[PDB]
């Protein structure tokens, strides 16, 4: 019944951040720039499209501000301007330097479909350096009541949120440029009110060192307020008499950077960017002590005032303006990749570390198949001995048959052993896919038999995708072991964690040609419940953001069905590189509904201790995840039904 | 008078963050570990020590932190902290839970010589995801009033300030963890009320990402709120049930990195670092918009606490603890150098280019002499011209003799002209050093004739150090022009623009081999007014900070002394490395500081237009640099003489 | 489009303070005589009339105020003056006894077609000396609420403003007598919260030195409010058992004297003027701490009540109720003229005093023309050596051809020198209008050239009008040299200050008949840049005010086109006293606004030290006028175009 590709309906909103043409002294002609701008917004389906500071007068002209026929042309421009917004979709912000009581101030004008729905004044206007703004305009800051443009009386001041009544994740706030420096910003104060999308109108001349300074204060406010910024400055056109301009543009969320334009452009640039109105009110909804916060500056945050207005956006398909990863566990970025890499395996380390001193270094018992899991957790295990100051000789790794393994044991100078539970499993099925459990219980069993017998304990070795999807023997079975240093990592990130441990090279080249091998070897369960690709991505969304089915079908489907689009992280070869149908990914999204919320919870409620890995969560209900083990998954398999097409 | 070498009488203040090791549930042993610690930054000389969040505890023992047993062993370990601290230098931030009214309190108890100076509990317990901090403690939020710690009531709250009485620049406030993450910290608030040192203890287990995340947010807290901020996070001890931990500890100041420690450590770590109280001082005097941020928020600034402690620091030579930059216009960091220079050619084109347009492109007169100023000039009044689609052959330039120039303006395609000004001088000397700015002026007398004649304006080509020693010939001179591309970048910083333009090749191989023998044949005035090195060095300190001038010695003794210590930036091949003794350094600093303040502000009272390029300033007297013409150096030449000795 | 000979299209408000007959204690011939002169003003087009305190009764009634019949027959009479006001223009405040609650209040009752928009009672009652209020009438300060009129509720109380809905820069506050002579009178906060026009009802019994205490009070009120005061005293008819009265009318504006009337008139008289609106407007658009006073105050300002009122003024050319200056520099009045050149020539001379001395005493180099500018600068630079026990032939003045120069450097005891520079010229534009810069590019590259021999300063000569106007051979030329004297001061005001220094007689006889031939052979460029009385009447305008273009047409027509109207200062012969058209005006100011905002601010851009001597404004760009020297002047012309009629 939805759209289903329809960007709006799965709670995206479309922003541009615009560096306009600037003619200093002329309206009309900075109107002209805007208005072209703002068209092409509407055209791209934006919802919202911020221009620079002082847009219609230009921000350089110094006294120029204070000449009545430059005031009268900004006031006749920006009525033009209000008239042409009937017919345009985004709302607009667009600078003004405008008339008010004694004096004119540094404005932001709100417009919406031929009204300006409120007038913003820039709170700290800086005199100091290169800057001489007090010179010409007041300070906004604690100034309220209403404005009088074009016959209409309209809200002034800073403490105005925008709220699109059809579209609550979208609660807009305007600030300028000076603004977000200072040590408590107005945005700061508007996203505890409820401001989603924070709007910078900038002029700020551009000197070395300063794009970086813009952007560390955008995107830690970003962060720190769960929330979109939308930040343009002022390009060419602006006055070079003292200063040079350099028109940046871009766009935040929460931190991440979504979109930016080309520095010292020749014409006009903008960002344009969906931004995702569903994860920042799933951050707000888990981060309870931004709430607190709220609370604590109840008085200051209570008091904004809040105008509404009807965006009406586009109901059809006009894409996604986004970058959706394929793997939200593996950075397509190498650096950011090699980083994650190098702190997971610190971190399973040290996590195993803690606990072999903790009890006066047990020899460690390790199940060893071959397969990439219990190949990682056996360096991880000899790794952490390593810094212990341990003989790799208390490590007793077993092969349990029903290759690379004992070469690889070999070649870690570890103690391997290859016992035969063929026979014992044999025994068991007389005494009472069955044969096949009976074998995983009785690798277990001696596991653990072993760990008592020779003063050890056992290491687990499965990981977190296995964990969600309950893929596992359960009770004595391979998710029992005194600590699992897997348990905290996908599957999709396993192979990578590998890779860097080859590339590391610390343990040298024999050692490395082993584990080549086996990445070779494994990489080319799967049958039963679907690709780990997308099951990785779909546990990512859930256990972050809690996203219902049909936006992660609409994520996974963006990121996944055409293997030509977005990026792949290194270790892909050409030949490796598959696409999904949406067919495909709603059958395996079905699968993970069921198993996830309903059948696997059981299984995980008696999880062993190991530590959380990555930022998007890990599945210990001591910890990350909390959840009934006798729950049916029926609303979500229906919200599939209703919302995601069948192919 | 002053003991030169003495980093604390040149008001920085040294400060430790420091990860101890943890035995959870133990508060001797966690105590011990402090307390060792804190005898080592004493040694150091620091004033202040913090180490991780609950650090007598253990931030990870979840309900262990409501057995009477562990709050007992907490107080007594307390104490006994507090005896020790008798003889300890530092200001000690130590993390305890400790009971107030009904609840427990996650603290940081701040400690000094044998007292409490308060207790400060944390504002935000976060309870999602892997915390589950509301369970065993109370929000300290809104709580003031006093606490008993060994028969003491003392301070306890969230709106605390510890000031130094005898070192002013240093008054610390204390937060714990999450208080930096929310959108309005408790920091932020004290910042504005007096804070420069703004500690954070933090348990943080760690994830993938998490470090960014803290870096973030701690230093875009240390530059929005012009500070330094000094964290420590738990390591190794810490429970990995279901948690691992990195150990990391980091000094931030004023968005600067001073310090960091190794991530997953084996063994105790701290960062130590020499902040200087006088940046932070000097930055807050010039930027009012901080303080218009105080006024408005003035009740909730206007409350906080003052309490009130001697740290009596050491007085003598403790080295310093910084790294001090050669050359604060050009970082030594490759990566950074070559956005710097990326940067400030952009800026100097995109300049003239404004120019350019507003005059309907007229022809460009440039006198060239083959020097790197003029050298340098050209190439960006070429791109300019490219960008603009504008002809090469409509740059006009002049060698005026009184080599690579005509091999440079023969390879750019540019229009060169040789006009040799030896004959009109000569009628000149007679018609009315002398000899030798008679040249200068003619030269300058020519171009603006030969404009005006070609419909053409005159640019500039001096450089900003230049603009600083008033070394020009004043009036019809080598000052004025029409539009100065160099007019806001220091000399030291134009060879490397020059670099920058040769890797970038954008010109092709022959201009890129006139432009490689310019350097090479230029690089090797400097006798009349020193070395540029240092003279930069000097104009950098007192154009952004106004320091005076034993800081700006101490400063540059430090950075230039011993060629072999710190780095030096690309393109300095070893046998260019020069080192200054401290007579040289003072030397010229007398030279720059009679100059600068008082002999050449006339000169550049009256400069043409053209961009400022450094964020350290340029010196506009519409812009960056406003001062009187006619005034004395004499304080500034009396303090060198009193307090910077002879050698 | 506008009527342009229409005072109100140009922001004017035309404004009547009326002394009416008082019959005591007979409301309805009080009221006759109040009804008769406000149709007077109806006719005259004035939207504002103001009365004498307590009109209605009389003021000096004493007991008889709290007579039942006078306090109905005030009432009666009240309410038929309320009736006949449908058919008036004006805003009416007229004075009444009137009842509220237990008492009677002193009232100002404002009238508006047809309805009482508000009553404002008096806040301070005098009882001292010959004041006995408090006995009969209540105190207004800290009164709000309603009272009841005619059967209507209405706004009462001593926190009203009344806004014109169609004529925003007028905004009325009404306070009454003594109000003003408090130390924080009523209006003072009003003109902080929007008030523009603040009027006083007076009785005011006349004593000697009275009236120079209201004079005081009402021009001082005006100026430190910038705003118009409007004063009304009572005269013939009130009681004279014990006191007098004169009956005085005034209008101020921001400390100026627009009108006054006939002290001790025999029957009545009115004060109406235009009050300028825009010239109150835009002096607080650039007295920026007039608003930061308000927000200091903000609690007390921002709660006045807004009563709204739509003035529907006459569209047409009523004419222009008001004395416009035809030189803004040179006053009419030989008093006030001879003060403001005094104290420009010791401006001028004082500035280069301490030029010489932080330089110690240099030679001074003067190239000197004959001309009027520079013939002025010797005679500075003559007293300042003077002042400063300096000898006269330290001062080297040079004639430089390409007469009264040498007669008056003769004359004076200084150095001259008279070089040819005919010759150098020659080589020079063989070496390379043109000819005729070459030549002004020359002058100023010898006098650097000798003053670098000499040990000596170029003064400059050129004065503020040519500044203005970039009238001035740009880089090396007359613009340039180490010290101005004139670059402050207007051409118009130039010739008086010779004057001035003529009749001081200080410099003896023969100086004073050097001078004297210059002033002859001088007086009688601008046919290029057009009269210099139109082009200095608009420096003004703009500079002070930043007025519309068509706003600065109206003002010079109405002070120019009419040799006979207005006055001339002093040294006008008749046969010297030029009237221009509209046309012309409109040519010169279409030449004035592109040299002005587009053409000459480069030229500006890097000016020599030198002070500002008017009170207009001066246009150092460190100074008076900081705007950017590439700017189009388009939107100026255009609004010529639109609105001044082509004659």
Known sequence: ???????????????????????????????????????????????????????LSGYSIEDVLLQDSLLDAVEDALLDLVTESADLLPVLVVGAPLRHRHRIYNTAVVIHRGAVLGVVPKSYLPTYREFYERRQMAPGDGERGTIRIGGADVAFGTDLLFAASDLPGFVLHVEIAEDMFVPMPPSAEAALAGATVLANLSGSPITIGRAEDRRLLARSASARCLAAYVYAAAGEGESTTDLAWDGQTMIWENGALLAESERFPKGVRRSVADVDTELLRSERLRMGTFDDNRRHHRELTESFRRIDFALDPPAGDIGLLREVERFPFVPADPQRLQQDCYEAYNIQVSGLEQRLRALDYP??????????????????????????????????????????AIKLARALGVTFSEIDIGDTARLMLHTIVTFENVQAGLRTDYLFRIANQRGGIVLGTGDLSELALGWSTYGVGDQMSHYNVNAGVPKTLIQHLIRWVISAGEFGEKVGEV???????????????????????????????????????????????????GNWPPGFPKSERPSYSLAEIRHWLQIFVQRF?????????????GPKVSHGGALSPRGDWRAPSDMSARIWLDQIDREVPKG
């Open 363 to 404: 020899k460690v018992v390790i199940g060893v198949s071959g397969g990439l899991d219990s190949t990682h957790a056996l360096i991880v295990a000899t790794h952490a001995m390593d810094r212990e100051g341990r003989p790799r000789s208390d490590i007793l790794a077993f092969a349990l048959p029903g290759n690379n």
């Open 515 to 565: 584990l080549q091998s086996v990445l070779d070897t494994e990489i080319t369960s799967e049958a039963k419940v679907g690709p780990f690709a997308l099951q990785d991505f779909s546990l990512f969304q859930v256990l972050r953001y809690g996203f219902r089915p049909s936006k992660i079908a609409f994520l996974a489907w963006h990121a996944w069905n055409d293997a030509e689009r």
């Open 597 to 609: 919320y309903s059948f696997s919870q059981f299984k995980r409620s008696a999880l062993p201790n």
């Open 1 to 55: 019944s939805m759209n289903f590709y329809s960007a709006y309906q799965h709670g995206f909103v479309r922003v541009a951040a615009c560096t306009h043409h600037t003619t200093i002294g002329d309206p009309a002609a900075n109107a002209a720039s805007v208005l072209d701008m703002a068209r092409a917004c509407h055209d791209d389906g934006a919802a919202l499209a911020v221009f620079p500071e002082l847009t």
